Amino acid sequence: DEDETTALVCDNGSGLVKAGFAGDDAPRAVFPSIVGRPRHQMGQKDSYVGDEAQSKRGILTLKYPIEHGIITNWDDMEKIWHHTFYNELRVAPEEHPTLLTEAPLNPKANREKMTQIMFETFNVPAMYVAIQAVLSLYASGRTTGIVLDSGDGVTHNVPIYEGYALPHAIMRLDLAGRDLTDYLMKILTERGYSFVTTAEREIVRDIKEKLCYVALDFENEMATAASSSSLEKSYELPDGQVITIGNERFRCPETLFQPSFIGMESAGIHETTYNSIMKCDIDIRKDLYANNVMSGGTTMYPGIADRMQKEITALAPSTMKIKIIAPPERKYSVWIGGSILASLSTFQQMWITKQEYDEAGPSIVHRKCF
Amino acid sequence: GWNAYIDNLMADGTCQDAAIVGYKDSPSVWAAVPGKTFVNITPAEVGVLVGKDRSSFYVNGLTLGGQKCSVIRDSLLQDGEFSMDLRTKSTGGAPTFNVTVTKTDKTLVLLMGKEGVHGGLINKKCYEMASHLRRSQY
Amino acid sequence: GHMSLAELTLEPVHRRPELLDACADLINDQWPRSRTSRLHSLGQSSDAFPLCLMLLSPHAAPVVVGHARLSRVLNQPQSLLVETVVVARALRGRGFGRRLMEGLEVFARARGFRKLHLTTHDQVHFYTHLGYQLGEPVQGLVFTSRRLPATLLPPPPPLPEETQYQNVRGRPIFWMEKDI
Ligand SMILES: CC(=O)SCCNC(=O)CCNC(=O)[C@H](O)C(C)(C)COP(=O)(O)OP(=O)(O)OC[C@H]1O[C@@H](n2cnc3c(N)ncnc32)[C@H](O)[C@@H]1OP(=O)(O)O
Ligand SMILES: Nc1ncnc2c1ncn2[C@@H]1O[C@H](COP(=O)(O)OP(=O)(O)OP(=O)(O)O)[C@@H](O)[C@H]1O
Ligand SMILES: C/C1=C/C(=O)O[C@@H]2C[C@@H](CC[C@H](C)/C=C\CC1)O[C@@](O)([C@@H]1CSC(=O)N1)C2
Ligand SMILES: [Ca+2]
């Protein structure tokens, strides 16, 4: 008889969707999670989606259907999924088991509506919903540890025991890449420049990704930057204008450790890691300290691993072994973990089938996916 | 009798342990798989499961028939769910297993899957057994 | 009276990728589904199993006569799952299906396998004619990339008064097997 279709894997982020086929080692498609609409003035269509909204962002206002990892606009999110299946992957959703990802502490009603839409609107044969941080851990070749998932809209500390996230100790932080980009725009403007537009915002995002780093000793790096020019780097804008950036390089991602830079009065990611660990079962805490896993684009700053080793070291007992693992592939480790999980021999029993959904209803997601 | 449920839960070969326990007035293990763990649930273990201190066992863990387990999810007293998911704790790399405890009007339904079996499958099975007995005012 | 006369070979898709297109054309003519998926499934073929074998014929290009997919079997090192066995529609009834399955047995046995497994409903007699028997369900192992981790006391009320023999649409299917 015909072989069964390979499962799809769709990691829905606040800024980027990553979609591909279970078993591959990298998504086939990575595109922005946006829907654009005409600013003022048929035009062509009522709305523009993903790669298309990106190419037309000059005449458009952009909406992010996912805010801080949570889906908030369901009609536009539906448009995103349609784009993923038919435009980006070019597959028939009714033919493939579909593995979706969700943010830690995703509200109950949200994952119910996720299951409902996938089954009733896209007619999937079967599906599953996995926590993004858990997939990242699987990608690191592990099933227990604490993950630091910092993307574009949200940062989470997720402690995981034997592949099961421990919600009671998850820690959420509404600070991520997009906020850092905004912060760099702000202080670059304080340096004499003018980055204030959405387009200029994308430009600053590239500046941030290509020249920022985390200082190991912040106050000592500030002194070096005030004493010399060794840390200053330049950046060529698309119009040939050239700007130069100094201590901003490491002031920007320093926000992760000192949210007060952006006016937030909350703990830095090191303090949140520690609190998360301390809310967990005593017997597993040592395994947490030795399996600190980083995922998300915002953890790709040069120097972040060494710095959080240092800070965690200083927060944790004097005998604790602490290890910070930053796979080179962690922009996409959540997706890779989904590929892994959906390819495992143990997963065939885990799918929610069209027939389980007919009998039990959307509530079934709360029983099979955690 | 009640043992006809242990088998009705053991029939699909997905679980290595199962039990029905009374938690009202004075807890007793009504039915369980012989020679396994749940058969030896002590009244103090029940009391912790159904007690009010829904916070300590997160950092202290808990025990079921003496087996150390870690708490993953706790909805055991919240209406509509009445469920609790756990994962056992082992020493020296020995395998661990997923546990689900559901609560009805008078009984605690406990299931421990065998190696590799996902906790969401055990949760579904336990939830369906509990819904059946709630449907029968148990 | 089905004596194939054409010169035929049996080669993995991933060693003749210029024929992958022709193979997808072949299978999707029998089981229509998205061409993106069929091309991907054939693109997973590898020496690590799953691998797709094409029955090919010399003579502009070579013809893709038939195809069968071979996967490894969970907990059964010596078993292979056979799926998606199809001969080109215009070439059925010439013995190419018998040669395809017999070539599968040779290929598998050379590599140390000793049991083939497959599912069918309407073609049960085609397989019994070639020696297959009714067996029990197996779980095939899907493709994982080389680059992935690869490290992973009141009385009781009344009672409520193997989905492996069912397939994608809820039909019953025969599990058949063969020693080789
Ligand atoms: C339906 C399911 O669930 S599993 C189905 C497996 N795959 C398919 O059905 C794809 C569509 N069908 C096909 O591709 C082809 O018909 C095949 C692969 C099944 C057979 O290939 P063909 O070239 O048509 O058959 P072929 O010419 O090789 O005949 C070989 C022998 O098998 C016999 N045979 C062929 N088809 C059948 C059949 N459906 N039932 C019983 N015997 C058959 C022939 O009589 C012949 O006998 P002989 O060689 O001992 O004298
Ligand atoms: N090399 C880099 N250095 C610094 N930041 C980077 C780098 N590459 C990507 N980023 C940042 O990562 C963010 C996107 O990461 P990611 O795709 O993990 O987020 P997401 O999953 O879309 O959103 P969520 O926060 O909901 O997970 C962007 O804000 C971008 O600025
Ligand atoms: C290259 C790239 C990176 C990214 O993370 O894409 C996301 C999604 C994007 C959507 C608008 C942009 C014009 C469209 C595509 C850019 C996609 O918004 C971001 O740029 C946001 C706004 S600024 C920032 O730092 N993150 C990041
Ligand atoms: Ca994410």
Curated annotation (Swiss-Prot), chain A:
Modification Methionine (R)-sulfoxide, positions: M42
Record keywords, A-Z: Acetylation, ADP-ribosylation, ATP-binding, Cytoplasm, Cytoskeleton, Hydrolase, Methylation, Muscle protein, Nucleotide-binding, Oxidation
Residues found modified as N6-malonyllysine: K56
InterPro entries: Actin (IPR004000), Actin/actin-like_CS (IPR020902), Actin_CS (IPR004001), ATPase_NBD (IPR043129)
Modified residues (N-acetylaspartate): D1
Any one GO CC term of the record: stress fiber
Record PTM ADP-ribosylarginine, positions in chain: R172
Superkingdom in the source lineage: Eukaryota
Substrates-to-products reaction catalysed: ATP + H2O = ADP + phosphate + H(+)
UniProt-annotated location(s): Cytoplasm, Cytoskeleton
Gene Ontology MF terms in the entry: actin monomer binding; ATP binding; calcium ion binding; calcium-dependent protein binding; cytoskeletal motor activator activity; hydrolase activity; identical protein binding; magnesium ion binding
Primary localisation category: cytoplasm
Interaction with alpha-actinin as annotated region, ranges: 105-118, 353-365
Protein role: Actins are highly conserved proteins that are involved in various types of cell motility and are ubiquitously expressed in all eukaryotic cells.
Assembly mode: Polymerization of globular actin (G-actin) leads to a structural filament (F-actin) in the form of a two-stranded helix. Each actin can bind to 4 others. Interacts with alpha-actinin. Identified in a complex composed of ACTA1, COBL, GSN and TMSB4X. Interacts with TTID. Interacts (via its C-terminus) with USP25.
Protein name: Actin, alpha skeletal muscle
Curated annotation (Swiss-Prot), chain B:
Annotated coiled-coil segments of the chain: none
Localization terms from the record: Cytoplasm, Cytoskeleton
Keyword set includes DNA-binding: no
InterPro entries to which the protein is assigned, alphabetical: PFN (IPR048278), PFN_euk (IPR005455), PFN_sf (IPR036140), Profilin1/2/3_vertebrate (IPR005454), Profilin_CS (IPR027310)
Tissue distribution of the protein: Expressed in epididymis (at protein level).
GO biological process, any: protein stabilization
Post-translational modification: Phosphorylation at Ser-136 reduces its affinity for G-actin and blocks its interaction with HTT, reducing its ability to inhibit androgen receptor (AR) and HTT aggregation.
Entry-linked PANTHER family: PROFILIN, PROFILIN-1
Oligomeric form and interacting partners: Found in a complex with XPO6, Ran, ACTB and PFN1. Interacts with ACTB. Interacts with VASP. Interacts with HTT. Interacts with SH3BGRL. Occurs in many kinds of cells as a complex with monomeric actin in a 1:1 ratio. Interacts with ACTMAP.
Protein name: Profilin-1
Organism listed in the record: Homo sapiens (Human)
Curated annotation (Swiss-Prot), chain C:
Organismal lineage: Eukaryota, Metazoa, Chordata, Craniata, Vertebrata
Statement: the UniProt record of this protein carries the keyword NADP: no
EC number(s) on file: 2.3.1.-
Residue numbers binding substrate: R33, R38, L39, H40, S41
Catalytic activity: N-terminal L-aspartyl-L-aspartyl-L-aspartyl-[protein] + acetyl-CoA = N-terminal N-acetyl-L-aspartyl-L-aspartyl-L-aspartyl-[protein] + CoA + H(+); N-terminal L-glutamyl-L-glutamyl-L-glutamyl-[protein] + acetyl-CoA = N-terminal N-acetyl-L-glutamyl-L-glutamyl-L-glutamyl-[protein] + CoA + H(+)
Binding site for acetyl-CoA: V85, V86, V87, G93, R94, G95, F96, G97, R98, Q123
Effect of R92Q: In NAA80mut; abolished acetyltransferase activity
Organism: Homo sapiens
Pathology linked to this chain's protein: Auroneurodental syndrome: An autosomal recessive syndrome characterized by progressive high-frequency sensorineural hearing loss, craniofacial dysmorphism, developmental delay and mild proximal and axial muscle weakness.
Domain of life per record: Eukaryota
Shown stretch of the complete protein: 56 to 286 of 286
GO cellular component: a single term: cytosol
Compositional bias per record (Pro residues), positions renumbered to this chain: 153-160
Keywords: Acyltransferase, Cytoplasm, Deafness, Disease variant, Transferase, Tumor suppressor
Main location: cytoplasm
Name by which UniProt lists this protein: N-alpha-acetyltransferase 80
Localization per Swiss-Prot or TrEMBL: Cytoplasm, Cytosol
Top-tier EC class: transferase
The keyword S-adenosyl-L-methionine is assigned to this record: no
GO BP term (any one): N-terminal peptidyl-aspartic acid acetylation
Similarity comment text for this entry: Belongs to the acetyltransferase family.
Tissue note: Strongly expressed in heart and skeletal muscle, followed by brain and pancreas, with weak expression in kidney, liver, and lung and no expression in placenta.
Documented effect of changing L74P: In ANDS; likely pathogenic; strong decrease in protein expression
Ranges of residues in domain N-acetyltransferase: 8-151
Outcome of substituting Y127F: In NAA80mut; abolished acetyltransferase activity
Gene Ontology terms, MF aspect: acetyl-CoA binding; N-acetyltransferase activity; protein-N-terminal amino-acid acetyltransferase activity
